[PDB]
Design a protein around this ligand. Structure first.
Ligand SMILES: *[C@@H]1O[C@H](CO)[C@@H](O[C@@H]2O[C@H](CO)[C@@H](O)[C@H](O)[C@H]2NC(C)=O)[C@H](O)[C@H]1NC(C)=O
Ligand SMILES: *[C@@H]1O[C@H](CO)[C@@H](O)[C@H](O)[C@H]1NC(C)=O
Ligand SMILES: *[C@@H]1O[C@H](CO)[C@@H](O)[C@H](O)[C@H]1NC(C)=O
Ligand SMILES: [Mg+2]
Ligand SMILES: [Mg+2]
Ligand SMILES: [Mg+2]
Ligand SMILES: [Mg+2]
Length: 528
């Protein structure tokens, strides 16, 4: 009757025990002492039972982490743990015999010396001896970290309920090592893994043409990102197209050692008193700006943002919105670039270009809050830049915060195309600057809830201010100017603030810094 064994459940955890008692009826002595090792670690978590119960079984950090008996390979950063068995790169001061208390098996993080920093391991990185690991703390359940860079679980389907493809799958290996990853990531079967340091999160492949990749739904911990010039080329020119080397350097201004009328105003904290309305932009002030027209009828549809000589952004809901019947093929549309009069045709200033292919961010969802309201379009032929056409620089995690702190305000350049899908009207491009508003103040002014993916902007209303919410085009650029490398970076892709109607308040724009890698897979998908 081993099934019995005066079970502890009642003797040692449903109430405490603290030894002997783990004696009368209990054999295999050192196992009574490996239990005791566990039990001394769980010490301070004696009440309630479930806490202790879940401490002893150890996928769980209590206090200084000694109790951990789970299976995590990786450190805080991404470094793989050097097996405890091992001396390369590091001869251990603490081998399995010297501290036989802790379970020093394989490379799973432990804490046999109970260092204040908690569970840790030896590194495969020769410059780093021991780096602590980030482990599920007891009673703060779920919360994936590092955008699923250290994801060692088993998720095998996309957000849209599609099947992941195997990571060899004949062609899924043919295109794998086409690009470099982090090899400290175990790419099993068909599970959702984040090789390429994707700021968006984990993902996998899907049935379709080569390189099809839905993303994976996982509860990531809330990254509250809101805490000639030298800007290195992230992209691969051949696929992405040229431009990045020189992006965000306005021909008529930056290159000509010129500040426009309202840019110096951006520096200041809202000098308690001075707002500036949406006047007309002067020429070459928002060159990356784009206009999306329907072909037949000649119907202006949406704003956009040049990022190269090749790729351009917009708001997914400009081509796909089933609440209407928006489903535009490439043959339905065209874009215009470097325009200034909405109505006139700019002869030998503006370029007309057609579409080659459209790419709706795979995690686009309109059936709730327009999550990932993002799209991507390639032009059937590249575009030649000028003093009127010029691309905007794209930011990363690091620049977000850097620019959302030091820089206080941003900028919405448009022909008010968002507003005017509602009334029935600016004739010429309007520029206007808006301060980013604290997220919590933005939260309790709106019903539709805000992920970390979206943010708010505008001046504070005080009972006598009418809502200038809805400045700019829909799918157009919100932009910011770095006071360090002196380049224009796009932060937002204008979306419907509420709709726009409801407002006597603030203005909404989707984040972009997490796109970076999603883009890189798409330009490859299409090709060179
Ligand atoms: C790092 O994590 C990997 C991935 O889980 C571990 O390797 C797996 O080990 C289990 C059985 O122990 C197998 O079922 C999987 O197929 C393995 N996957 C591999 C080898 O890719 C591995 O144990 C961990 N590494 C260390 C050094 O502990
Ligand atoms: C563990 O290292 C210590 C270093 O003080 C040494 O005494 C012992 O022989 C080593 N044993 C093993 C198995 O590594
Ligand atoms: C648009 O319609 C076409 C059929 O003409 C088809 O490709 C598809 O069902 C629609 N596109 C989307 C994204 O739903
Ligand atoms: Mg019970
Ligand atoms: Mg007893
Ligand atoms: Mg007794
Ligand atoms: Mg007794």
């Amino acid at each position: 009757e081993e099934v019995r064994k005066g079970n502890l459940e009642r003797e040692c955890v449903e109430e405490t025990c603290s030894y002997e008692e783990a004696f009368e009826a209990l054999e295999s002595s050192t196992a009574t002492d490996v239990f005791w090792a566990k039990y001394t670690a769980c010490e301070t978590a004696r009440t309630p039972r479930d806490k202790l119960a879940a401490c002893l079984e150890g996928n769980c950090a209590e206090g200084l982490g000694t109790n951990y008996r789970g299976h995590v390979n990786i450190t805080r950063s991404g470094i793989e743990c050097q097996l405890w068995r091992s001396r390369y790169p590091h001869k251990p001061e603490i081998n399995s015999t010297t501290h036989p208390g802790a379970d020093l098996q394989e490379n799973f993080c432990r804490n046999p010396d109970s260092s204040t920093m908690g569970p840790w391991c030896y590194t495969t990185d020769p410059t780093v001896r021991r780096q602590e690991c980030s482990i599920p703390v007891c009673g703060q359940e779920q919360c994936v970290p590092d955008r699923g860079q250290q994801y060692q679980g088993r998720l095998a389907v996309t957000t849209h309920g599609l099947p992941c493809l195997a990571w060899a799958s004949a062609q899924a290996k043919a295109l794998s090592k086409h690009q470099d990853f982090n090899s400290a990531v175990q790419l099993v079967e068909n599970f959702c893994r984040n090789p390429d340091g994707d700021e968006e999160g984990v993902w996998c492949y899907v049935a379709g043409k080569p390189g099809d990749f839905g993303y994976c739904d996982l509860n990531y911990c809330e990254e509250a990102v809101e805490e000639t010039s030298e800007y290195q080329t992230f992209f691969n020119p051949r696929t992405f197209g040229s431009g990045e080397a020189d992006c965000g350097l306005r021909p008529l201004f930056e290159k000509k050692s010129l500040e426009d009328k309202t840019e110096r105003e951006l520096l200041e904290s809202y000098i308690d008193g001075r707002i500036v309305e949406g006047s007309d932009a002067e020429i070459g002030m928002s060159p990356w700006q784009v206009m999306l027209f329907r072909k037949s009828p000649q119907e202006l549809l949406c704003g956009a943002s040049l990022i190269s000589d090749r790729w351009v952004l917009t708001a997914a809901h400009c081509l796909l919105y089933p609440p209407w019947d928006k489903n535009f093929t490439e043959n339905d549309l065209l874009v215009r670039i470097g325009k200034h009069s909405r109505t006139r045709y700019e002869r030998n200033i503006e370029k007309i270009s057609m579409l080659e292919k459209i790419y709706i961010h795979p995690r686009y969802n309109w059936r709730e809050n327009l999550d990932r309201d993002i799209a991507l379009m390639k032009l059937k032929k590249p575009v030649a830049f000028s003093d009127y056409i010029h691309p905007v620089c794209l930011p990363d995690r690091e620049t977000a915060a850097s620019l959302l702190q030091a820089g206080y305000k941003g900028r919405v350049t448009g022909w008010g195309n968002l507003k005017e899908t509602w009334t029935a009207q600016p004739s010429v491009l309007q520029v206007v600057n808006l301060p980013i508003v604290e997220r919590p103040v933005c939260k309790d002014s709106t019903r539709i809830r805000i992920t970390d993916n979206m943010f708010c902007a505008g001046y504070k209303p005080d009972e006598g201010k009418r809502g200038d919410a809805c400045e700019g085009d829909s799918g157009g650029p919100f932009v910011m100017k770095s006071p360090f490398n002196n380049r224009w970076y796009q932060m937002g892709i204008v979306s419907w603030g509420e709709g726009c109607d409801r407002d006597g308040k603030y203005g909404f724009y989707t984040h972009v810094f997490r796109l970076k890698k999603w883009i890189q897979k798409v330009i490859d998908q299409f090709g060179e």
